[PDB]
Design a protein around this nucleic acid. Structure first.
Lengths: 164, 198, 180, 105, 122
RNA sequence: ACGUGAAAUUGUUGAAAGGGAAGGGCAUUUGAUCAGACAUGGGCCAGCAUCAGUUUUA
RNA sequence: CGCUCAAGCGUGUUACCUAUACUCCACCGUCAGGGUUAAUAUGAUGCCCUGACGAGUAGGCAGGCGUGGAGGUCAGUGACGAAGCCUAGGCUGUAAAGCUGGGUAGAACGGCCUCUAGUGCAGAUCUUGGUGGUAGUAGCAAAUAUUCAAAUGAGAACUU
RNA sequence: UAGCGGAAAGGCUUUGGGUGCUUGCCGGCGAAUUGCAAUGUCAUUUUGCGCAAGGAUAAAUCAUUUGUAUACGACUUAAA
């Protein structure tokens, strides 16, 4: 009898605007951060630029501790008190399209060899930023050693009391 | 307020129900313990009384075949063990799982002595009970009702002490020094800073 | 025909015996003592039971049976020497052995693989109790069967594999550890 | 060097319950050195993960995890209500659980 | 965007003392007792079927596919479901012969109509 | 002791549990097993951001 | 259990735990109050909107599920396998139940619209038939008594 | 190399040799792509599998027998 019509949902005109992010006051360009989650967990790093997909452009000089130019989510990071000046650094060319990528069909396996396929643009751009920051970092004592070491909780340390 | 592989408590000066009241709670939290010197747990009341609140527990038992009736242990250790396996629903895995975490001795056996033990304030005849009352010293009690070792566990609890005195003294000289010198030596600049760093 | 077996049919022999007038409870205890033994071992054991050296352990059907010292072999107190139960089972083994000889199988490797004894239709017969009451007096006959097999080595081995699966970030963990 | 711990230790105490009846959808969690409600409010809305091992290898590993989070405080002794993606075994009463530091401020 | 199905109560309503006594089957039957606790609803006992457990009107008589099943015994019985592939799935009967399944399954796959069974013996 | 050959009830093999009974309801975990649209040229499980409805805590 | 400036008795001041109760949202059903084929495909019994309520023995009414036969209709299904039976396989319905994979087996049987009844069982010290635990247990003890060889026979405490 | 420790000692100091690292203070190379988080697997038990070194070379039951025992088991004796 009925056998429903194969017409379709065509949905109501929604009312949800895309307003920009309001970041917390602790994060300001130049601030040292502690990475909580991910591959480089508990690794001290440097904040550079706010990107336009609500992520943080983060270096933490590759020559010091081996952490490259990388995206980071703001909720999975701590903001410490220390800062460094970024007046002799560019960070204009970097955008969301800079970190674009072709996800590969798919594929796996035998040795899905992989020590390959890094751009010369990415290697040279790493050298320019690291050279500017190291001149700034060598002003204050014991900062180069601070970024090298990792963060780990001790017996007695209660996170709710600490300042960071 | 921190977790450890084990926690050794030194009864003495400690009451009973109030101590037992804690020793238990813990367990229900995958902890551990190992009371000692039980032969020194204090109990509110005038010696006499108590012994009555006992001679009555001792006159409670099956009628048609004791053997299977309430087993009245005499030795202390087990006592401060009863006042507990009664504060726990000890008829459900969880219960057991809890008692296996425990252990109580009257005296101080090896697998410890060489370890630091602690007290549990909220329960020390001196922070509670008012001054001018009367408290019974377990052991002594037990005796008058069984337990034939209130003279052995005493002849030993000595072969120990006597020594602990030595270990000490030796632990002053070495320290009466490791402190002496930290007096001159670079006790400078590096402090005029660390003294502030704090 | 034949109960739930799980062995090679080509290297096997069998023998049945339906509507036998023996105790169903006693024949079960004889058929479980013999089970899992070598064929030549068994025929000597059943002869020793008749002459009172060895004994049959009564495990399941054993209420109000007396104790005996011969039961210590198996680790059970109660045991008996059922004559009539053994003579029927001893007969079926000699039939099953001759069946294997016809096929051309080795006697030394031959062992009892499967054995079973379920109930039969009961023969009915009456008695006279007090105050003119008639009760039954029935028999409990048996349906015996057994299977013998050429015993051999190398039974599993076996079996499963994997065809593995893991994520990209989980794959990436292996890449670094091979380098270091 | 020695320690690599980026989480706070804790213990799964019990379910939300009355005298007799209980509710296994909400769990109660203890935290190290948290004696008040005011101190425990630091740990609200933080991710929590129970860890346990197995014999069989499911997906190239012998460790399985049940994710969850903290909702609100419970009582006047720093005890915390906690929800999980799937509820916990009940044998886990008095077992270790990891309180992470993300969704941070 | 099709509404996601929620079954409310997936566990089967068994009759009281179905496992206890053999003669009492597992088909549901209301207790008409006076001492009975299942009728009066006591804490820690079996549930009873009630209108509150009923499914949503948007997604009633739909499987995991989101399709209402129709029973088919022949090729001429497939002609109601020609322009209704997304809404109505098919299922071939138990009494149909082996060769006649191949006749229905051939012309079913032409029009793009999903059959629940078949599979098809093989 | 002959078409089909159900249940009570029994034997064998396989799997599981068992400290004064078993057997149920709510919720997980582990062990087993099972449905369901990534096929064309060669959906399931989460994370962050800005909003709406109801609340809580400084 | 244990408790003694209490974990006791009288009184005050705050926090906190918690019912199927109260507030808010999702879905189900029942009842009421409306709006609409003005050609405008598919059920006017339709297709939508808004608001309230939900315990229940004895009892009454309503709407459905199944069993055996009768009239109609799908030119329904079937020896290339109908009915029945077994299945820690699957899907739908709140449920009564229905549909379907695998095995066994070998002649008939289903859906939809109506008619009709010897039409649904757990109880009745229910009726007839079958089988358990109890249990290889109770027991097979009154009339004085049996023993040794030989023969027959597959086999002899019991026959000659 | 020395000694201490019987309460459940199964652990504590201790002479000396040999062999690494040393963030006590300065240097020079390396890490990227696990792609914006997904415990990201670093413990500790048992266990029997084959290796290859070192080491040793038995008893108890049943049947028979006894009466200091004995409902039947058990117990007590003897026997190359």
């Amino acid at each position: 009898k009925w056998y429903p019509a194969e017409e379709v949902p065509a949905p109501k005109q929604t009312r949800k605007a895309a307003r920009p992010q309001k970041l917390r006051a602790s994060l300001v360009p130049g601030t040292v951060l502690i990475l909580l989650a991910g591959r480089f967990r508990g690794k001290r790093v440097v904040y550079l630029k706010h990107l336009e997909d609500n992520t943080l452009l983060v270096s933490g000089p590759f020559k010091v501790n081996g952490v490259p130019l990388r995206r980071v989510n703001a909720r999975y990071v701590i903001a410490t008190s220390t800062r460094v000046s970024l007046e002799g650094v560019n960070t204009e060319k970097f955008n969301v399209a800079y970190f674009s990528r072709e996800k590969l069909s798919r594929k796996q396996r035998a040795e899905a060899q992989p020590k390959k396929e890094i751009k010369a643009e990415r290697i040279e751009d790493q050298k320019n930023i690291d050279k500017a920051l190291l001149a700034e970092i060598k002003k204050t004592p014991l900062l180069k050693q601070y970024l090298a070491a990792t963060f780990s909780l001790k017996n007695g340390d209660r996170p709710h009391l600490l300042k960071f | 307020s921190s977790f450890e592989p084990v926690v050794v408590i030194d009864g003495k000066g400690h009451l009973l129900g109030r101590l037992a009241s804690t020793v238990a709670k813990q367990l229900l939290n995958g902890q551990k313990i190992v009371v000692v010197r039980a032969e020194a747990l204090n109990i509110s009341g005038e010696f006499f009384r108590n012994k009555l609140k006992y001679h009555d527990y001792l006159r409670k038992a099956t009628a048609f075949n004791k053997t299977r009736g309430p087993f009245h242990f005499r030795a202390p250790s087990r006592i401060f063990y009863k006042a507990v396996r009664g504060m726990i629903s000890h008829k459900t895995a969880r219960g057991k799982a809890a008692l296996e975490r425990l252990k109580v001795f009257e005296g101080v056996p090896p697998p410890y002595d060489k370890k630091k033990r602690v007290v549990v304030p909220q329960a020390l005849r001196v922070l509670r009970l008012k001054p001018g009352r009367k408290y019974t010293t377990l052991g002594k009690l037990s005796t008058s009702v069984g337990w034939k070792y209130e003279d052995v566990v005493a002849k030993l609890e000595e072969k120990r002490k006597a020594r602990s005195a030595e270990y000490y003294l030796k632990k002053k000289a070495y320290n009466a020094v490791v402190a002496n010198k930290s007096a001159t030596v670079g006790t400078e600049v590096s402090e005029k800073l660390a003294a502030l760093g704090y | 025909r034949y109960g739930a077996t799980s062995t090679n049919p080509a290297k096997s022999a069998s023998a049945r015996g339906s509507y036998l007038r023996v105790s169903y409870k006693n024949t079960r205890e004889t058929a479980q003592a013999i089970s899992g033994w070598n064929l030549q071992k068994a025929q000597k054991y059943l002869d020793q039971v008749l002459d009172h050296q060895r004994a049959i352990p009564f495990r399941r059907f054993n209420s109000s049976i007396g104790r005996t010292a011969q039961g210590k072999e198996f680790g059970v107190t109660k045991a008996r020497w059922p004559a009539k139960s053994v003579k029927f089972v001893q007969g079926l083994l000699q039939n099953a052995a001759s069946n294997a000889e016809a096929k051309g199988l080795d006697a030394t490797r031959l062992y009892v693989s499967h054995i079973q004894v379920n109930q039969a239709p009961k023969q009915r017969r009456r008695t006279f109790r007090a105050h003119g009451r008639i009760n039954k007096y029935e028999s409990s006959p048996s349906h015996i069967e057994l299977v013998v097999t050429e015993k051999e080595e190398a039974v599993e081995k076996a079996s499963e594999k994997k065809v593995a699966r893991l994520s990209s970030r989980q794959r990436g963990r292996l890449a670094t550890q091979k380098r270091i | 060097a020695e320690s690599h711990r980026l989480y706070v230790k804790g213990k799964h105490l019990s379910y939300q319950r009355s005298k007799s009846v209980n509710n296994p959808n909400v769990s109660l969690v203890k935290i190290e050195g948290v004696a008040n409600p005011e101190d425990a409010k630091f740990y609200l809305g933080k991710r929590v993960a129970y860890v346990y091992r197995c014999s069989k290898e499911v997906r190239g590993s012998k460790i399985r995890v049940i994710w969850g989070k903290i909702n609100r405080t419970h009582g006047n002794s720093g005890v915390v209500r906690a929800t999980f993606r799937s509820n916990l075994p009940a044998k886990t009463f008095g077992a270790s659980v990891r309180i992470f530091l993300y969704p941070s401020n | 965007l099709h509404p996601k199905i929620v079954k409310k109560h997936t566990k089967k309503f068994k009759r009281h003392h179905s496992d206890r006594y053999h003669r009492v089957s597992e088909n549901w039957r209301k207790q008409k007792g006076i001492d009975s606790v299942v009728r009066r609803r006591f804490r820690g006992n079996i549930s009873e079927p009630t209108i509150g457990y009923g499914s949503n009107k948007k997604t009633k008589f739909m499987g995991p596919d989101g399709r209402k099943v129709v029973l088919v015994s022949n090729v001429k019985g497939l002609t109601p479901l020609l322009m209704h592939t997304k809404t109505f799935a098919a299922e071939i009967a138990h009494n149909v012969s082996s060769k006649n399944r191949i006749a229905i399954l051939a012309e079913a796959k032409k029009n793009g109509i999903k059959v629940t069974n078949a599979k098809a013996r093989l």
